């Protein structure tokens, strides 16, 4: 477990990385609106979908960060949504997929971002936060320690990245200030600061520039292990009249993947993208994983 | 006009083809809903568009067939539409672009399919057909002869492919039976039979199969100079909610282009596609043009 060649095994690429390395330092691929794969097929006539394949496909391709959007039902469960629409995927469904993947590849960790996507259904016993933490988070698969989480402690576990308020249970990355459609910097834990580029609805040119600017900042601070960088390459300029996410991703994915490959960086951050598949070249998630050669 | 190498010049690829060859026999690339390029950029937030670039770009990339959809205005002019949507492009605009292209590349011909896209605006002097023929068609740039039109008579002219009824002037291809969302066969003139694959809203798998079936048939009737084959690779399956033409084209264009390249046929027909650009490999229109190597 000490060969850069091991990074080529997309199901176990975190294996060769030293356990003392903070997850924040690792360049990690992620999927934006991860659970939208069941309604993505154009025949479904549903807009806003961002993935063609399921969670296991995403994980087997190298993704370790998942952007989960949930809604509390009146049955005390959390289901996945995209705005007001139910995605026909549940939170338990995602967790089970992550569990199996971790069982098959115990060298890896799964980072789960959880955000309240839609108002709770009327008649729900508790709140979104209380229901999640009490019925889901309590599961031992979820790492309950915090700080600048190290890969060593995360292996075989799901590390929560809170994007919901009202948390009362310790574990993962605390919820932090997340302004809308901006590139911002704030604090996360006592020993972790973060910079996020999440301009999800700006024009194409400003988006590519923003992705590159944030990657530049990431590289210029490559060995600052206490600074977290999250870079969303996903874009949806417009409302719904135009299901533009795929169009933009078809250009952005290859462009950014190529930019990374050409710069041969030592760190690119946590790159969250739309449409993980094998259609474009180079493959963004693969180039992101390869940027970890410096850590081997 | 002696080397197949000349087919590589997208702006003058018809130059090396013998003048006696009927246009129907030539394998010709075309663009579906050609004039939707001004509203295609996602920033315009308009669904259903099919081309990213203007007419000259399309022509400079090898397209010689243009799918023009017009509507008669109260000012007695014909403007381009997509259903009830104004495309901000006029018929005169297209004609002038074709005129300049033909002036710069006199070896080529431009085939203009013209369809009445939306009911006339109340208050118009005459009808769509009468207005078109009186204010546009009378121009000498439009070839006025018929029959199984030969490339020789078409060079330097615009050849009309009527998709509207009521025509009262000679020239180009006569309007013919065009059923909705089907693969059909009929007659244009007493000198030309026609087979058209235009299943614009069928599942993806049936679409690809239909394209290939019609293409195989074309190959099997490669020497039938009296049979015209029009094959639309464009697909928009799904309500307006899911602006999927680009999604489908991103898969279909490369898939069909590869199919042609591997089969190296002697004829593939008039292949009308969505999104002519330089993004995919192989390039469909390019392979369609190269299928004329045996005619040289």
Swiss-Prot record, chains A, B:
The active site is at residues 32, 82. Its EC number is 4.6.1.13. GO terms for cellular component: extracellular region. Keywords: Lipid degradation, Lipid metabolism, Lyase, Secreted, Signal. The keyword Signal applies. Its main location: secreted. InterPro entries: PI-PLC_domain, PLC-like_Pdiesterase_TIM-brl, PLipase_C_PInositol-sp_X_dom. This is 1-phosphatidylinositol phosphodiesterase. Residues 20-163 form the PI-PLC X-box domain. It is an enzyme of class 4 (lyase). Coiled coil: none annotated. Disulfide bonds: none annotated. The lineage of its organism: Bacteria, Bacillati, Bacillota, Bacilli, Bacillales. PROSITE patterns: PIPLC_X_DOMAIN. It is found in: Secreted. Cleaves glycosylphosphatidylinositol (GPI) and phosphatidylinositol (PI) anchors but not PI phosphates. It comes from Bacillus thuringiensis. PANTHER family: PTHR13593, SI:DKEY-266F7.9. Transmembrane segments: none annotated. One of its GO terms (molecular function) is phosphoric diester hydrolase activity. It catalyses: a 1,2-diacyl-sn-glycero-3-phospho-(1D-myo-inositol) = 1D-myo-inositol 1,2-cyclic phosphate + a 1,2-diacyl-sn-glycerol. One of its GO terms (biological process) is lipid catabolic process.
